[PDB]
Amino acid sequence: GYVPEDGLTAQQLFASADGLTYNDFLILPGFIDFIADEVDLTSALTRKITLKTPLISSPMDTVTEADMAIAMALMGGIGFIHHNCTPEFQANEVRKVKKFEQGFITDPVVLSPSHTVGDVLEAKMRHGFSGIPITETGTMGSKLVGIVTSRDIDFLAEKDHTTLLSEVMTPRIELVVAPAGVTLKEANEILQRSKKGKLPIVNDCDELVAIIARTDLKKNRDYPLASKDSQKQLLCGAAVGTREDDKYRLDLLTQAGVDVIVLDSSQGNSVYQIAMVHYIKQKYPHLQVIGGNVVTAAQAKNLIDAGVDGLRVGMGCGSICITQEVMACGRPQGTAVYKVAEYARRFGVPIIADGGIQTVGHVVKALALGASTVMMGSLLAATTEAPGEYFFSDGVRLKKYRGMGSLDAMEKSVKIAQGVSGSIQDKGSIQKFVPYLIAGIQHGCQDIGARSLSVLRSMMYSGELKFEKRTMSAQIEGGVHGLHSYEKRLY
Amino acid sequence: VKIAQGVSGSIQDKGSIQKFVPYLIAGIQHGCQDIGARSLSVLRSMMYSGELKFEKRTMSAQIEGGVHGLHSYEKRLY
Amino acid sequence: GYVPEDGLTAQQLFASADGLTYNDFLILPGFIDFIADEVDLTSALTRKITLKTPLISSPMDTVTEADMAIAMALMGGIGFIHHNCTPEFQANEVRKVKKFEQGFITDPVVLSPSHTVGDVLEAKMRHGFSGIPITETGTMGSKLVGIVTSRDIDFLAEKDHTTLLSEVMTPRIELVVAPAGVTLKEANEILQRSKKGKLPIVNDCDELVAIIARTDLKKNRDYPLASKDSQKQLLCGAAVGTREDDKYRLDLLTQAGVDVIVLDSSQGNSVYQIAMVHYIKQKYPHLQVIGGNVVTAAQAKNLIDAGVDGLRVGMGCGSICITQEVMACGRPQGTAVYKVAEYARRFGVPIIADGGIQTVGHVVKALALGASTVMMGSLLAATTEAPGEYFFSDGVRLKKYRGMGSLDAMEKSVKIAQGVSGSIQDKGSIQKFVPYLIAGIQHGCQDIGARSLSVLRSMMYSGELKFEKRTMSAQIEGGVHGLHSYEKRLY
Ligand SMILES: Nc1nc2c(ncn2[C@@H]2O[C@H](COP(=O)(O)OP(=O)(O)OP(=O)(O)O)[C@@H](O)[C@H]2O)c(=O)[nH]1
Ligand SMILES: Nc1nc2c(ncn2[C@@H]2O[C@H](COP(=O)(O)OP(=O)(O)OP(=O)(O)O)[C@@H](O)[C@H]2O)c(=O)[nH]1
Ligand SMILES: Nc1nc2c(ncn2[C@@H]2O[C@H](COP(=O)(O)OP(=O)(O)OP(=O)(O)O)[C@@H](O)[C@H]2O)c(=O)[nH]1
Ligand SMILES: Nc1nc2c(ncn2[C@@H]2O[C@H](COP(=O)(O)OP(=O)(O)OP(=O)(O)O)[C@@H](O)[C@H]2O)c(=O)[nH]1
Ligand SMILES: Nc1ncnc2c1ncn2[C@@H]1O[C@H](COP(=O)(O)OP(=O)(O)OP(=O)(O)O)[C@@H](O)[C@H]1O
Ligand SMILES: Nc1ncnc2c1ncn2[C@@H]1O[C@H](COP(=O)(O)OP(=O)(O)OP(=O)(O)O)[C@@H](O)[C@H]1O
Ligand SMILES: O=c1[nH]cnc2c1ncn2[C@@H]1O[C@H](COP(=O)(O)O)[C@@H](O)[C@H]1O
Ligand SMILES: O=c1[nH]cnc2c1ncn2[C@@H]1O[C@H](COP(=O)(O)O)[C@@H](O)[C@H]1O
């Protein structure tokens, strides 16, 4: 009882070949012994950061500001906030991602009893929340005198500046508290049992040292996949360039609490980028660096030698990109992902496959070819969390989608354009769309017979995972064909 | 979370199966005849023995083998 | 000194390959030592028929009836008259081609002196000419009593009904004549010196044996390339099927004086076709037979063994054709032409490359690959000489272009359609368009460095002629590209 070997290994697929794209090949089906829902999508972003989902939103001005980065992190991916903005704007976007979910809030909004209901309303306007502990100084480290929330100031008619907070607080005698040096789980038990919405943390001197909010425990149960640091804040990435003024931007982003930096370049194998990696790794040794838009092992070597914690793979793929028709330079993305990942895995360096991801099948191909994570631009553009506003043109709801080497982006929003500037049709919310991509990746892995992305890659490197090349007519046959009209209702 | 594996489309009218399947039958018979096969059983035996020969097509052979070079046409099958 | 070898030989181009079309390759340029106008286009149609031009009009109901066949023969090609018509209609189309140019007219229209001016006008209405010798019987072999022409009946208004020809003729006393047994060249000298428009040929008994017309000497100087038989009539081809009733059609076409028969089939390697070739070669040993739409040497063998004088090459190419998507069956035409011609040349059997000829570059490729002649359907459709009438549809002057297995042709104009009943935009006259194709073939051969189609084929078989295979992007680069609009003003 024997059956002959069928299809190519990945090593065979890229050996006797020109550069393949994701469209040029299929994965052959395996054996299914498991449910798609039990497929593990745990992914290394860098040497020290693991995501529950392989998915990254690209650092583009039409893709990733704070709402996208929050939504991606809540879905168990991450967002890298774009750098086509002032350093102060970018750091404020990073701060919004880091403030959205909290363990101990150690720098809350605080007011004095001498402040007013108008000051609580203006605080709610600036920071988005009404739950404000009150201390004698109105600064964080002071003796606690009460707590003010929206239930204390709501349905007061108009006496805003007229009313001092001392008359409006829940006074410190009435408030439930925990001692300093309580663990987060112990503070959560106290808060959960108290049935209150805030729990202040106070030392033996009765002065405020932290506070915790019930809404973060709600965000816990609401978002099981969420990408969080050790102090339970969302993970945030940010882009920086490799110019000297990017050192100032990097300092603002690091004090804003950014977890990972991506060095943003067309061609990352440069003296400028290697110098920036060395500068970061000496000044901020805690900070993860993804360097390198690279497409060859020779480029990957120089950045792994410089000490990057991850690599970005792709050049001239990417929906919006024209680098290949402007510089002659790049690689077919499936070949680039395979070549760079097969090399970078020897050093324990994870790969991000960046650009040309049009479909969830392309995500499964990128992951199968050795990418540990996948970065999307246009596939997440025209979601609700993507920056800017919808418009109508051809009777179609469209959002702008620009590209960062677009000459319109380079107006600080001879110079050479490396991107066009375009539009994409509406997609709805990341919070529904990323669960569709997750379940699509799981069903892809299931048809392949892989229980996780880790076993999927090991099946690929051992040659258990088999591939078939597609003729152009196989790419037609594998697409929608032969119909008059069709309705591509994904999820 | 509820993964679609197909789209939903439309196709133009074809008429009855009781006329269309006799057209497919006769097309299969004419294909086998141009090939020199008296039955689908002998067609498969010619294929496995290597008597049946195939040629690969470039994309331009797929263009040349279709309708080409016309302003418009009328695909009046049966 | 030395220069390295560049490009593939034809043997290499088809060896390590899938089936190529004409679009899939180029011919590499040679050395030019001659003018394009001195490129010899002399072509074998069959073992015994040589044309001055490689060009054939296809036997289709929307391409070749008598006007097309006359025009093709005058341009030094040939037409094959289609068979999707009654045997009597097809033989009458052949008769029109054979009557258009004459050496000795040995079966002229003749009248009695007791016929009338009205009988001469009715004769002119039926046969197209007014020059009618008069014999006392009104039958050919009888005593010459005079000659009547249009200048004799000219401007006789309504005197038609009862004016006997006796008083209208130029009488036999006045007419210039030649003796029987005069050569055509000698009769032409007598006619040319006489300054008359007819010269009757009479025996010593003074009875009519032939006549010659000055208009045939005019047709001589007007058409230097013209394809003529030994008695100076135009060459005509005709199609026939291989059914039993085609034996009757073949008898009508042979007594109408057809020079060459083409056996019309999608797949000519059949017992039915081999039987028809044997039947023709025993019943009509003078008659040239082109058998075989064939695409392999194995098919060609059986018809060359049956005794065909030429082969048609092509299956499922052809603008109008759907045989491949209806029968799975055929071959890429460049490969078919090369394979069959390289085999058939060993037996001295010429090849017609039939169908898929969209451009004069495809003609040069077909001839370079070993075709001795090229047959066109759609490229000659919507010329003025093509059958039927023009119409307008999309604001475009169109003519119908049908195909012979199409389901509109097979209604005597379960049935399986092998063609698609379409339309082609106007091209103007064959008498202008074929000189353009001739000049294009000559400039193709000149860029290649071939002084004739015979040396072109010899350079191909010796491997002196080099080919380069084309990517799809070379086919884009080789076409019109990068323009907003263009005007393809050929000739
Ligand atoms: N106050 C607070 N407590 C948190 C937060 N995140 C987690 N915790 C607490 O720490 C525990 C951690 O266990 P899990 O919930 O299994 O792991 P997690 O990765 O931290 O959170 P999930 O995102 O829900 O998976 C939770 O039960 C909470 O009590 C947060 O943002 N704020
Ligand atoms: N109150 C408060 N919440 C903060 C602060 N910084 C971040 N947050 C987060 O914002 C959220 C507060 O949620 P809630 O407790 O529902 O908000 P609230 O304070 O009651 O204010 P309202 O919803 O406006 O009534 C939690 O996820 C907090 O972690 C801060 O200084 N104070
Ligand atoms: N009456 C007549 N004489 C002809 C005809 N064709 C040729 N001739 C005569 O034969 C001569 C030989 O002509 P050529 O030019 O050598 O060769 P051809 O193929 O016969 O004629 P072309 O068609 O002009 O090439 C001409 O000069 C005429 O005198 C014809 O159709 N009718
Ligand atoms: N006259 C004549 N010409 C014939 C006959 N059969 C074929 N033809 C050809 O038709 C053409 C006759 O041309 P002309 O001599 O110009 O015709 P015509 O006799 O002057 O008559 P009109 O043109 O009507 O004045 C020549 O090419 C002949 O070879 C026939 O029976 N009689
Ligand atoms: N730790 C606490 N101990 C006692 N009272 C508290 C405490 N935290 C908040 N309060 C008081 O409880 C009331 C509700 O505040 P809480 O944070 O629980 O809900 P809220 O977020 O304001 O309610 P809601 O979501 O409906 O707007 C207010 O009067 C507030 O001052
Ligand atoms: N061989 C001949 N000998 C003498 N007269 C002739 C001869 N052939 C024709 N004719 C006469 O010559 C005259 C002109 O006839 P011919 O054939 O030469 O020209 P046509 O074709 O009739 O002239 P056109 O082209 O102008 O219409 C007529 O009267 C005719 O009867
Ligand atoms: O202007 C540009 N030129 C070249 N590459 C760009 C430009 N802007 C963004 N990119 C790349 O394109 C990727 C997104 O590609 P997409 O997912 O196919 O739309 C980004 O993550 C970048 O790597
Ligand atoms: O109905 C048909 N089906 C298949 N082949 C046809 C049919 N009618 C004509 N042909 C072929 O198509 C050739 C003309 O092709 P074309 O020059 O490309 O237009 C003819 O000479 C025939 O060999």
Swiss-Prot record, chain B:
The conditions that induce or repress this protein are given as:
Constitutively expressed.
Cellular localisation: Cytoplasm; Nucleus
Where does the chain bind IMP?
A: 5
Domain of life from the UniProt record: Eukaryota
Tissue specificity here reads: IMP type I is the main species in normal leukocytes and type II predominates over type I in the tumor.
Miscellaneous note of the record: Because IMPDH activity is tightly linked with cell proliferation, it has been recognized as a target for cancer and viral chemotherapy and as a target for immunosuppressive drugs. The activities of the antitumor drug tiazofurin, the antiviral drug ribavirin, and the immunosuppressive drugs mizoribine and mycophenolic acid (MPA) are attributed to the inhibition of IMPDH. In addition, bacterial and parasitic IMPDH's differ significantly from mammalian enzymes, which makes it a suitable target for anti-infective drugs.
* Protein family (similarity comment): Belongs to the IMPDH/GMPR family.
In its UniProt record, what illness is this protein linked to?
A: Retinitis pigmentosa 10: A retinal dystrophy belonging to the group of pigmentary retinopathies. Retinitis pigmentosa is characterized by retinal pigment deposits visible on fundus examination and primary loss of rod photoreceptor cells followed by secondary loss of cone photoreceptors. Patients typically have night vision blindness and loss of midperipheral visual field. As their condition progresses, they lose their far peripheral visual field and eventually central vision as well.
Q: Subunit comment for this entry?
A: Homotetramer.
- By what name is this protein known? Inosine-5'-monophosphate dehydrogenase 1
Mapped onto the parent protein, the portion here is 437 to 514 of 514
